[PDB]
Design a protein around this ligand. Structure first.
Ligand SMILES: NC(=O)C1=CN([C@@H]2O[C@H](COP(=O)(O)OP(=O)(O)OC[C@H]3O[C@@H](n4cnc5c(N)ncnc54)[C@H](O)[C@@H]3O)[C@@H](O)[C@H]2O)C=CC1
Ligand SMILES: Cc1cc2nc3c(=O)[nH]c(=O)nc-3n(C[C@H](O)[C@H](O)[C@H](O)COP(=O)(O)O)c2cc1C
Ligand code: SF4
Ligand code: SF4
Ligand code: SF4
Ligand code: SF4
Ligand code: FES
Ligand code: FES
Ligand SMILES: [Mg+2]
Lengths: 59, 433, 217, 43, 230
């Protein structure tokens, strides 16, 4: 259960799991997440910016 | 002696539909030989108030299934003119599984229907009658058209119908395969060239009906008996059956009987006497009876213990928690998969839902899937209660009564045959580990 | 089970707006008579018969037929599409010459309708959603057709064939494909909705005119 | 008077246009239809 | 006057004849749940979310289409009304897709909000859901019809407000779909408003897709300068 350095994960196929719902951005108590998204070239809903300020993050 | 306590043996002289089996000429001359179109001019000249009163005192209730008192319903249209034409719409959709009486009336006694249209339209002040017949009844529709052509040639209908100075037209309209178009508002929408989707009430058709004009929707059987009630007296009609359950009724006995048939009988006949006398009894004897759906698929079923003394009228069948409906008796003996039959009915309702409103459109398909899983035993007993609640969420919450009529058989099956469901569930459970 | 058919239209060489369809002049006279039945100012009320008339002339309902009906009755084509897709008697896909409908609802299910269905399937060699390669028979299941008293039964092109047995339906099928046309009705020596044997009611001759008329009228 | 025979045998020779032909024949007997005042609700 | 007296939860209200139960309820600040009713569209009565209990009446009535009678007492928060709302929301969510994270209607959904305020919190639906193919009606309106709840708001808007009769319903029962039945573009100078009237993500804005969430946005009230309508 240990909480340490953040990471973005993938599906087994190698496609990114993130779909830019921005739930993590809305729940972040420190406002440490910044997200920008747009339709990808194939139409997939994917982020273009995903930033985490680790000096704002309370882990 | 007055105040009869036994009902169910009426002789041929008191039967309204004297050509139910098509043994006599259904044409105009044959119908006149049977007493049709007799003193119609006098009945029209009596006036709409006299006809409405004669219908009222007859105690007649709607033969479409809901059993609404016909006199009040037809007097709802006794308002003065407001610039809009007034119309009579005769329901001939005949969509209930188990029901075949309207087809026999139309194909064998069409002049009774035409004269009923004329008399009812005069009573309501209607300008014309639209007969909405099922699209599958092509031969019946053409027979009705031939009868209407003969009535027009005769001068019975149309301008100066009979010789009373009243102009009345009778049109025939054919649907295209939709049971929901039996609903009065859905039927009205179907006539107007839209989808057969019911309207909300209010307004009632007596205020806003077909083409936005005052309209009354009546069953073919209800309309057909009107001239006989006017002629023979109406008080003669009330002499049959119990109080508030008066007259004669056409019954369709189908399913597990020796001789499935359409018959005419006194209203308050016991169910057992009806099945024994006319249908030849249950297949394999009365002890082989398992269940009966008394009034078509929309009515909850009853087991053999209830069928022993039940009377075949509205109030008695309400006391048995099933209702009279269309008086279509579907009989199932002990060799049938009753869960499968109820699932087939639910699948019928799933395929006949118009999909307009959320409770029907969703819950009926949900119950269909649940009953399909129940048939194989692929569920757990708790879901039974769940299914019950699902039906309770559909009943009373839809636009039209199709949701009610889809929930009712499920409720009847759960009420009377829960141990069968649990036995199937446990058999599937230990069969599949 | 499920619907199976689709409720969207995709263009196709055999079904597209340029597909040739038009009403025959006698069919135009029939359309005029149909339209005359309804009040002036309410012409959409004639979409149900006229569209059906098209299906009688053509055998099915292409998109061009729907467009023609909409143009004739001066209604939006979407309303005609809604009517065509709502009602199951309309064929938005070509069907065989003899369209066989088998009722499988509970009253007919009780009187061995599955035997009739499987007899038809094994006689024709096609399933419940297929047409014969010679395009003479299309078989489907339907809901209650209104003749439960005469179960089991099928409908073939505006005709009822009731009180069926597998031999009876096989005979009907093999007579139909020989170029003839079988007589409709029950195939059990009953020819009505009467009880199978005995005629328990209506045995007496019908009463004459004015038999029970009340006094004062 | 007889009951051994079936009298509804005319529907054995009905074609696909019988209903509409009957409607055309009946067209001459009908009263003039009422008018709503417009050609269509979209007018 | 011509006003008649009705009661909302026992409070007297004076309303003009022809006022519906919904308008009488909103005359005291009570907003009845709704999905298919729009005050600028014709009444539909199909969603059934607005069902409310009238005192001494066994049947609940559709508040969006039911004119108030004299002396009626509307019970907007009785057990019958709450149970009706829960059942209707259960039916609505039975076949709805689990699309909220990828749906642009995420924080702006009437379905979501009315599920949180009037529906239950669990699901007892143990079957498979239905799936509907998408329809292309142009570059402005993105269509994902699995999220459609068949309120027919778009159809009424097109037919009445826009004067375009291209939208409708095909099929019946559970497999009833809203569309054009043909590959047809829905071009109208007011075609984008169907995005706003649609309570769910079935109709969304294509240029706006995936770029923002409603809670991030700051709202500035301004005036349009693209014409002289202002
Ligand atoms: N014969 C058939 O093929 C079928 C028959 N049914 C039967 O239909 C029955 C339910 O039909 P519904 O029309 O929904 O019943 P309902 O109770 O709502 O009304 C039936 C008739 O009474 C009139 N009516 C009722 N209340 C009225 C009022 N307050 N003011 C004026 N008029 C009023 C209605 O206009 C209608 O014509 C079912 O019980 C079923 O047995 C159902 C399916 C098929
Ligand atoms: C789903 C549904 C289907 C119906 N189908 C029919 C039908 O086929 N024939 C019919 O007469 N009534 C049908 N009804 C009820 C009609 O409203 C009824 O015929 C009409 O009220 C006339 O009743 P009356 O005979 O009391 O005048 C149906 C009702 C519902 C809810
Ligand atoms: S935006 Fe955040 S919560 Fe949403 S999928 Fe991506 S990482 Fe998960
Ligand atoms: S209950 Fe079913 S058939 Fe009746 S209006 Fe609602 S969806 Fe249509
Ligand atoms: S429309 Fe609303 S409820 Fe449906 S998936 Fe989108 S956010 Fe969720
Ligand atoms: S697309 Fe939206 S507005 Fe149109 S019917 Fe579906 S849910 Fe209603
Ligand atoms: S159940 Fe087969 S005709 Fe009705
Ligand atoms: S808001 Fe009343 S039924 Fe939809
Ligand atoms: Mg939207």
């Amino acid at each position: 259960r240990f909480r340490g350095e953040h990471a973005l994960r993938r599906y087994p196929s190698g496609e990114e799991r993130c779909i830019a719902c921005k739930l993590c951005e809305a729940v972040c108590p420190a406002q440490a997440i910044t997200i920008e998204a747009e339709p990808r070239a194939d139409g997939s809903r994917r982020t273009t910016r995903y930033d985490i300020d680790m000096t704002k993050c309370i882990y | 002696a007055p105040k009869k306590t036994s009902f169910g043996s009426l002789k041929d002289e008191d039967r309204i539909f004297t050509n139910l089996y098509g043994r006599h000429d259904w044409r105009l001359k044959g119908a006149q030989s049977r007493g049709d179109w007799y003193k119609t001019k006098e009945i029209l000249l009596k006036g709409p108030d006299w006809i409405l009163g004669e219908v009222k005192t007859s105690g007649l209730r709607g033969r479409g299934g809901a059993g609404f008192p016909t006199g009040l319903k037809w007097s709802f249209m006794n308002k003065p003119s407001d610039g809009r034409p007034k119309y009579l719409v005769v329901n001939a959709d005949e969509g209930e599984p188990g029901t075949c009486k309207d087809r026999e009336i139309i194909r064998h006694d069409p002049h009774k229907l035409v004269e009923g249209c004329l008399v009812g339209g005069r009573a309501m002040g209607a300008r014309a009658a639209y007969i909405y017949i099922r699209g599958e009844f092509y031969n019946e529709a053409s027979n009705l058209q031939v009868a209407i052509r003969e009535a027009y040639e005769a001068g019975l209908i149309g301008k100066n119908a009979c010789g009373s100075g009243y102009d009345f037209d009778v049109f025939v309209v054919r649907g295209a395969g939709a049971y929901i178009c039996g609903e009065e508002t859905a039927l009205i929408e179907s006539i107007e060239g839209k989808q057969g989707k019911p309207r909300l009430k209010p307004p009632f058709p007596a205020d806003v009906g077909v083409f936005g004009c005052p309209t009354t929707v009546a069953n073919v059987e209800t309309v057909a008996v009107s001239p006989t009630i006017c002629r023979r007296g109406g008080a003669w009609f009330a002499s049959f059956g119990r109080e508030r359950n008066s007259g004669t009724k056409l019954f369709n006995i189908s399913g597990h009987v020796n001789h499935p048939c359409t018959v005419e009988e006194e209203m308050s006949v016991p169910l057992k006497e009806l099945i024994e006398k006319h249908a030849g009894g249950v297949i394999g004897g009365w002890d082989n009876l398992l269940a009966v759906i008394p009034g078509g698929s929309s009515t909850p079923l009853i087991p053999k213990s209830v069928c022993e003394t039940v009377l075949m009228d509205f109030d008695a069948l309400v006391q048995a928690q099933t209702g009279l409906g269309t008086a279509a008796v579907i009989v199932m003996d002990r060799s049938t998969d009753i869960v499968k039959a109820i699932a087939r009915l639910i699948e019928f309702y799933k395929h006949e839902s118009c999909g307009q409103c959320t409770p029907c459109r969703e819950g009926v398909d949900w119950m269909n899937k649940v009953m399909a899983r129940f048939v194989k035993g692929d569920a757990r007993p708790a879901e039974i209660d769940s299914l019950w609640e699902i039906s309770k969420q559909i009943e009373g919450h839809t636009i039209c009564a199709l949701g009610d009529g889809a929930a009712w058989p499920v409720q009847g099956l759960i009420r009377h045959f829960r141990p069968e469901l649990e036995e199937r569930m446990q058999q599937f459970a230990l069969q599949h580990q | 089970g499920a619907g199976g058919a689709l409720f969207v239209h995709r263009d196709t060489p055999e079904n597209n707006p340029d597909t040739p369809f038009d009403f025959t002049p006698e069919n135009y006279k029939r359309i005029e008579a149909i339209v005359k039945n309804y009040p002036e100012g309410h012409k959409a009320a004639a979409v149900l018969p006229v569209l059906d008339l098209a299906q009688r002339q053509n055998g099915w309902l292409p998109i061009s037929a729907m467009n023609k009906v909409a143009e004739i009755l001066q209604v939006p084509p979407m309303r005609v599409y809604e009517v065509a897709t709502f009602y199951t008697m309309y064929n938005r896909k070509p069907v065989g010459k003899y369209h066989i409908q088998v009722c499988t609802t509970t009253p007919c299910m009780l009187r061995n309708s599955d035997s009739i269905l499987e007899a038809i399937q094994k006689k024709l060699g096609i399933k419940v959603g297929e047409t014969t390669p010679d395009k003479l028979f299309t078989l489907i299941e339907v809901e209650c057709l209104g003749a439960c008293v005469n179960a089991p039964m099928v409908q073939i092109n505006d005709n009822y064939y009731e009180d069926l047995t597998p031999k009876d339906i096989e005979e009907i099928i093999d007579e139909l494909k020989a170029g003839k046309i079988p007589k409709p009705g029950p195939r059990s020596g009953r020819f009505s909705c009467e009880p199978a044997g005995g005629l328990t009611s209506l045995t007496e001759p019908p009463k004459g005119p004015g038999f029970g008329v009340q006094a004062g009228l | 008077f007889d009951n051994s025979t079936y009298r509804n045998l005319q529907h054995h020779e009905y074609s696909t246009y019988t209903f509409l032909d009957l409607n055309v024949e009946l067209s001459k007997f009908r009263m003039p239809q009422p008018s709503s005042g417009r050609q269509s609700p979209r007018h | 006057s011509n006003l008649i007296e009705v009661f909302v939860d026992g409070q007297s209200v004076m309303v003009e004849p022809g006022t519906t139960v919904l308008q009488a309820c909103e005359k005291v600040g009570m907003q009845i749940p709704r999905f298919c009713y729009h005050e600028r569209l014709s009444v539909a009565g199909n969603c059934r979310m607005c069902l409310v209990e009238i005192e001494k009446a066994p049947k609940v009535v559709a508040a969006c289409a039911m004119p108030v009678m004299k002396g009626w007492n509307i019970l907007t928060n009785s057990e019958k009304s709450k149970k009706a709302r829960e059942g209707v929301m259960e039916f609505l969510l039975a076949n709805h897709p689990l699309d909220c994270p990828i749906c642009d209607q995420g924080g702006e959904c009437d379905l979501q909000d009315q599920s949180m305020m009037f529906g239950s919190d669990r699901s007892r639906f143990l079957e498979g859901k239905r799936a509907v193919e998408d329809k292309n009606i142009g570059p402005l309106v993105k269509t994902i019809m699995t999220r459609c709840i068949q309120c027919t708001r778009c159809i009424r808007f097109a037919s009445e407000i826009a004067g375009v009769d291209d939208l409708g319903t095909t099929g019946r029962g559970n497999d009833m779909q809203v569309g054009t039945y043909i590959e047809k573009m829905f071009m109208s100078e007011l075609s984008g408003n169907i995005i706003d009237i649609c309570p769910v993500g079935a109709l969304t804005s294509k240029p706006y897709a995936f770029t923002a969430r409603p809670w991030e946005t700051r709202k500035t009230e301004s005036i349009d300068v693209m014409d002289a309508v202002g």
